Ligand binder design. Structure first.
Ligand code: EMC
Ligand code: EMC
Ligand code: EMC
Length: 297
């Protein structure tokens, strides 16, 4: 029951081991709070151009137990939020927490497959944080997103781009990462253009710099060990430059031609904004609508 994304560090912290902190949160609770603050910060950068007063409906198409679906709805009482998660236990837990907070009239989580089951509404904002690289059928997913996106709406993604000639695929973990060109055409095919693309790769690599991790996790139960090894592999691919971890802010441009959307997306991906730049801009603007950092007392 936490934020489960990787997080950006401006610098490597010597001695800091992400695997020990993530996998032993009861032994390193205050370090886990340090990580949480960076998880929150990265989400703030993702959301900091949205006007939540204008938003009326939000979809999270890989909502896990529904963290943002619940928090957005409780922070903004005029918003209705929907979440899709493939995991039955996560939907049940999310809908329990929705009930425990009396948000059932405005927040609802569905145990459904975002690449196959049609989203039930039209949304002003659609969020997918570390979702789409777990999904094999990319066109089904982005057909679903585009068809449920209001004309003036935004799609917000946190996802990987492959910097290789071909996509980066791994069937045993069912991970598929499109190349730059594949992203250009996938978005353009479904009427979507990149408004902003922010590269977090160096800062994610700083946080995941964990030199003994492969030895450490061999001292953990096979369950744990099997789970975390995908974070290790992404760490390795990030360090090598094979993939990039990015924040996507997309808009719909349906009255525009495919070729024109393609050229736009190409220009944007050739000049990704460094995360420190986007973060400094957010801080200097003073506008940080969601999430808020937790504070003592
Ligand atoms: C992978 C935890 Hg910042
Ligand atoms: C090379 C523009 Hg799609
Ligand atoms: C204008 C900073 Hg999000």
């Amino acid at each position: 029951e936490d934020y489960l994304t990787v997080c950006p560090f401006e610098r490597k912290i010597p001695g800091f081991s992400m695997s020990r902190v993530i996998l032993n949160p009861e032994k390193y609770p205050l370090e886990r709070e340090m990580v949480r603050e960076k998880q929150v910060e990265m989400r703030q950068v993702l959301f900091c151009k949205e006007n939540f007063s204008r938003v009326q409906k939000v979809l999270d198409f890989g909502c896990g137990h529904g963290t943002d679906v619940i928090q957005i709805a409780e922070l903004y009482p005029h918003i209705k939020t929907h979440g899709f998660t493939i995991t039955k236990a996560q939907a049940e837990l999310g809908n329990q927490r929705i009930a425990q907070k009396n948000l059932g009239a405005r927040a609802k989580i569905f145990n459904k497959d975002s690449s196959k089951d049609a989203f039930p509404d039209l949304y002003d904002m659609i969020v997918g944080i570390e979702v789409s690289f777990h999904i094999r059928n990319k066109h089904g997913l982005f057909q679903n997103i585009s068809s449920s996106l209001n004309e003036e709406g935004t799609v917000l993604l946190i996802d990987y781009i492959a910097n290789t000639r071909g996509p980066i695929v791994d069937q045993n973990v069912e991970v598929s990462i499109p190349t730059v060109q594949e992203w250009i055409e996938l978005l353009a095919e479904h009427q979507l253009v990149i408004d902003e693309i922010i590269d977090v790769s160096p800062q994610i690599a700083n946080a995941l710099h964990d030199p003994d991790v492969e030895q450490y996790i061999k001292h953990l139960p096979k369950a744990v060990q099997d789970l975390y090894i995908n974070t290790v592999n992404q760490s390795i691919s990030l360090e090598r430059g094979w993939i990039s971890y990015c924040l996507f802010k997309l808009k719909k441009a349906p009255h525009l031609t495919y070729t024109k959307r393609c050229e736009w997306n190409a220009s944007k991906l050739s000049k990704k904004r460094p995360y420190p730049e986007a973060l400094a801009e957010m801080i200097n603007s003073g506008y940080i609508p969601y999430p808020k950092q937790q504070t003592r007392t």
